[PDB]
Symmetry: C5
Amino acid sequence: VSPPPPIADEPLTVNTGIYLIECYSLDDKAETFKVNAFLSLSWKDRRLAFDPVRSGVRVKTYEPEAIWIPEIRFVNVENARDADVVDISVSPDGTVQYLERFSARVLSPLDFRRYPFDSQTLHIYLIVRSVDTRNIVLAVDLEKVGKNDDVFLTGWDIESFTAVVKPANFALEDRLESKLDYQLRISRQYFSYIPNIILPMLFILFISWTAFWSTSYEANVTLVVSTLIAHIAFNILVETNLPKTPYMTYTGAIIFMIYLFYFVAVIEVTVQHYLKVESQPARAASITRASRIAFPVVFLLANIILAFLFF
Amino acid sequence: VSPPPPIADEPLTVNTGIYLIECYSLDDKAETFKVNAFLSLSWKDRRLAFDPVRSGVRVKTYEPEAIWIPEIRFVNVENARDADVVDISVSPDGTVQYLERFSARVLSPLDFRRYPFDSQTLHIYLIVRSVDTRNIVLAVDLEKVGKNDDVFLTGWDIESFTAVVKPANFALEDRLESKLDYQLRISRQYFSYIPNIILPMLFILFISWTAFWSTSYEANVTLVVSTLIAHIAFNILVETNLPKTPYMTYTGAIIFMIYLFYFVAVIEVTVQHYLKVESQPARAASITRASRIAFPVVFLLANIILAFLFF
Amino acid sequence: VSPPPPIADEPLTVNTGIYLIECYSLDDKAETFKVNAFLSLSWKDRRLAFDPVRSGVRVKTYEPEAIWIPEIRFVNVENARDADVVDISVSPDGTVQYLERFSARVLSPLDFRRYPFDSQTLHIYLIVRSVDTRNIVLAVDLEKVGKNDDVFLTGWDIESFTAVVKPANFALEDRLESKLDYQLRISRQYFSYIPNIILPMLFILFISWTAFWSTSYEANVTLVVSTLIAHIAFNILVETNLPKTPYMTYTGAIIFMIYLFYFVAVIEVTVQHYLKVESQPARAASITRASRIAFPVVFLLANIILAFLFF
Amino acid sequence: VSPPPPIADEPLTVNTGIYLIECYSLDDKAETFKVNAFLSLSWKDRRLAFDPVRSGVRVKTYEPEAIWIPEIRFVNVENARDADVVDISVSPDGTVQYLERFSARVLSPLDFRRYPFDSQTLHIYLIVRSVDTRNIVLAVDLEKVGKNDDVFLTGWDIESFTAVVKPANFALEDRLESKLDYQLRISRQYFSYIPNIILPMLFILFISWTAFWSTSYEANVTLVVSTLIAHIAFNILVETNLPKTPYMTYTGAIIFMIYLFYFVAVIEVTVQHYLKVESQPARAASITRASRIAFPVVFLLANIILAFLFF
Amino acid sequence: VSPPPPIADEPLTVNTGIYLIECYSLDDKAETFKVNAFLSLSWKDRRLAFDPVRSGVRVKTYEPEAIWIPEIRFVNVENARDADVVDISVSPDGTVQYLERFSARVLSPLDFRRYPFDSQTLHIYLIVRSVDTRNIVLAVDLEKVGKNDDVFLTGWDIESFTAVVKPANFALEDRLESKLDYQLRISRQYFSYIPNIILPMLFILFISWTAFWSTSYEANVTLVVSTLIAHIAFNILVETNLPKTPYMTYTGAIIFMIYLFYFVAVIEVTVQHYLKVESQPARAASITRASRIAFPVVFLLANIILAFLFF
Ligand SMILES: [Cl-]
Ligand SMILES: [Cl-]
Ligand SMILES: [Cl-]
Ligand SMILES: [Cl-]
Ligand SMILES: [Cl-]
Ligand SMILES: [Cl-]
Ligand SMILES: [Cl-]
Ligand code: NA
Ligand code: NA
Ligand code: NA
Ligand code: NA
Ligand code: NA
Ligand code: NA
């Protein structure tokens, strides 16, 4: 078996199409996702053409080893896809119609800057290395690109599955390569983050602020220190569901900013006590009374600034 | 090897049957379940007809590669099933009786709204793609569909294993497809949740309410703060055994509601102190005395409302 | 290849034997165990008989594909066993002696009611499906059933490896089936549970009871609350090494019972304070003096009751 | 293919040799370790002997399927080794020189009595089963047993790789077996345990002892209770890196012993307070002054006793 | 198939080249990394040479089994690489051009001394064992060595991918071996460590130092003890992302040093109280006033010393 010969000096166009059957296991830390899909390929081989009159059949079914099949690979995969050939069908003119059902772990990097209010564009890169005889160029058959209705990705909303129709052909090791881009747009389901992380994290912060309505230093220390410990637990729980990013995330910004409010609340609680012991509770009272308004106002403005910068 | 030819213009009916041997590893986070079962297939291939007078044997046994076997696949699987052919038996009329024992991790979505007092309907989807020569339609052989008595799923009660007899015949990529639905009904064993999560989480809440029978603000802060920290541990322990859902779960609702009771208890504990220091313990006493009745009544009614909304 | 023909109308007896080489990875949560053992099979095939005086050779060695071998499978396995044929030897009369070394993950349910003072009976179920020509029945060759001396299972004491000699012959999908039961009796090594869980869990409880020799409510709150937090940590550490059972475990019972002692200690600590503030420390003293005797006595009796109920 | 015939009535000696290429993943909980090594085998087969004069070659290279190769297996392995044949070479006298590169997960039990100041002897057991024709005996070719210099095992110091030259010949299932022992001596790198576990665990204990220079019961309760909670965290952190042993470990002994010092410190702290309230601070002072000397002396002596018993 | 014969007595030079497609999963604890790359091989086989004028063809394509291919292996791999042959092309003179796309988990040790401000040199070792007929020597074809622009390693900056052109030729088990070194230089992205570990760990330390501006021993105990517990949580969180090293890491040094500051702060807090009770608050005040300057100065200098020693 060898590639079909060119009629003139034109490259062989292999029409592609991916139809997603099952979408699952999106690892945020590993920036991977597992896919189960159909792969449809179509090319013209004149050597396989026949007259439907003499042959007595309008279509001929072949085994993979019997005829020449182009070496189609995925760029961003962990290991080689678990392919299983469904059907190979030849038309009288010699147009081969290949179909296989595969499963692979895809390496698609994620952008956590707006986490957990982020949207992602997952990529599937189809590639073909040109042979010495003739060059192979990929094309998108929009009729054979899709996803079924039951495709669900846990914790994500599947927006669309499209393909960049124009391939990005390039030279690699003195041979041509045709690359295609299959984009799967998704958006995070941030609902669970509100009652599990955001709201309990805010309650522990407001509970620490009840120290501006107390003169008991021993109770204030317990209030601001204990709630800080709960924030450390929340900061740890968050950084376990996320990878180490060289940029600041939206949640990461808020979490880090809250570590300063706890630090300033400790300073205020110490100042109030030092002034009380120094027999000047008039200054201690005015600082405490100011903090009652300062802390919520600065916190609310700081969040408006952050949310503005991130969105 | 090619498909059997039609006597008239009828599609080939492949009679199916799944018999569950072992049911294991139900992942709640991944919404998967591993199954070890028998798969029985039956189709008429007249091309395999024989005379037992001549051949010597009443029933003929073939190897999988020897004869044509229909390409039966599962829709909702992670990877291709680990199949092992048990027996292929052809009768003189050509009726093939296929039997294989497989193992696959099935992708069946779960509903955690009533967790841990929820019931699920797990699905197994058999599918067959029609060939160019003739169409293939699936059928259920109710005699060969079941599960053995020893089938146990850890933490679950296995109700039934049935099949939707009428197949879903639909067009996919210009070819006909026959889909079958194998439903496995299960219900959760909620017993362990009561002494491990529900009751210890209630004890820590009632312990916080002993602050309504105390005038010691420093002891009250320790009481309401420390028990809130224990409740954060309980909220974390629960959200680790569950996936991030875009809906509110029953336990998630209760856990979140308890966060408000700790927040209001902190306000009461602060109010009582502020009034005591302001030299008006008559107001502080009446608020504290009211909270002794208010907190248990509101909590009891709020739970009746939630349980009503969820069930 | 086809099954040996019956001399009369008797079923083919396949003599079995499992010899455990390596026993490892007992997962308590998954109720699985990995095994590496020898499997010996023996049946009579007259078609393979030869004259000992003529042939010269006493025994004939065959390849697996050359001769007919019965399809022996395991019922309670995750996936198909990793078998490797060691030797196939035929006697002059036609008795075949098969030997293979396998490795499989076995699904054997566990009983945690007496945990960590529990004993288990692990099962290995051999099964054979009868063919259309003749029926196949399993038998135990007690000479070829065993385990080597070096077989160690981490955290467990291996008692015995026996087989239920009488097979379970039953009908499944219109064909006969012969099932064998290989039982491996083990008992847990509870030594590590005493200094790591039981004794530290008792020390934290007795430390909470030092609040019956204190009048300082602020110190008593710290004592009873802080120790409860440590007990929650132990309750969590325990439920992570165990699966969700629909029954009460022995440790689970003790752990849950201790939650009540903390709850009553909190009530006593609150009562003592309420009476002190109410200017009647005579009642507060008598309640505190009684609890010094009540708490250890009730705890000691409650444990005798539990241990009695469980053992 | 069949085994070489004996010249007299001598058993076939297969000369072995393992050369470790890569040593990795020593699981302490699972008592396993992965290996990547060369396996060299050598036996005399007269049936393959040739004259180098007429052949015109000093050596002859064969494929594995072409000639008879002895079935060499490993006793203590999880699954069958991932073998890849490097070279098969035959000398004119018929001496076969086999070489393969394998990878296997070895089951070698560990002794944690002196942990983390322990040394281990890892085992690799080569085994050969004798055939009906003639018996097979293993031998060590010390020239072909080694390990490369770059062999590193994370957290361990690799001492030596030697083999017990005399094989253990024994009967198993009516057939003779030749077993060889390849011992890999290693010793733990205990450096990381000192600043991460030992020293931080000692600091928290000495911090608890500052309660012998304080009369504030509320502060002493906070001191001894809080530090005990940190010790529980250290006790848990340690038991997660170790399997459940039916013996006491060196670290396990120290950790458990410290639990008693925390218990006696709580008793002393309670005694001091009870005596203070009972208006006899002269007794309370003498007990507190004694504990300042008693606690460090008893702790220092108790450690000398333990270290002596363990080493 | 056998190796090409030497024209004189020269060894066969196999020109190599690795082109990295995907770089992923760098395990710090396991000191491993998964790669997906192209492997290009080139050698001269005169037995395959042909005339380009009469043959009409300039290049001839062969199957792997058709022609002799050198046994190229990787030294530092877990298991054998998942290779898939892309193309085999022969030139008129007999120069073979092999290309395969592989995936393997590489064992490359890491240096954590400057963690998380460390840089690593990952290694890939190509090796070839010489045959009895002739010796095989490796060479680097710098034209076919590279990495694509999209190669991303989570949490790391990929500097370069180069190869040590001169191979290490050495004797192993009486046969010659040729080894090549492919070095992949990377540097850690330390950005995430600052707001998640470094800065929160510093805030809790400075919060403990507010005890130098307080006379309340009960509040000082709460301050220094509670913050130390948070530091233990940070020490644990760090030692989980790192393997047990026989050397001191930069973070490990800082974390351990901070343990001493908490220990000295506890001593100061005890000294201040003992002097206050001893009715000499003039000495207690001067010690407390000195510690206000001492603790930040000593900490700042100690860090300059450490950073100097490590960098
Ligand atoms: Cl691929
Ligand atoms: Cl280009
Ligand atoms: Cl090109
Ligand atoms: Cl399937
Ligand atoms: Cl099996
Ligand atoms: Cl093996
Ligand atoms: Cl390799
Ligand atoms: Na082909
Ligand atoms: Na077939
Ligand atoms: Na306190
Ligand atoms: Na057979
Ligand atoms: Na052989
Ligand atoms: Na070859």
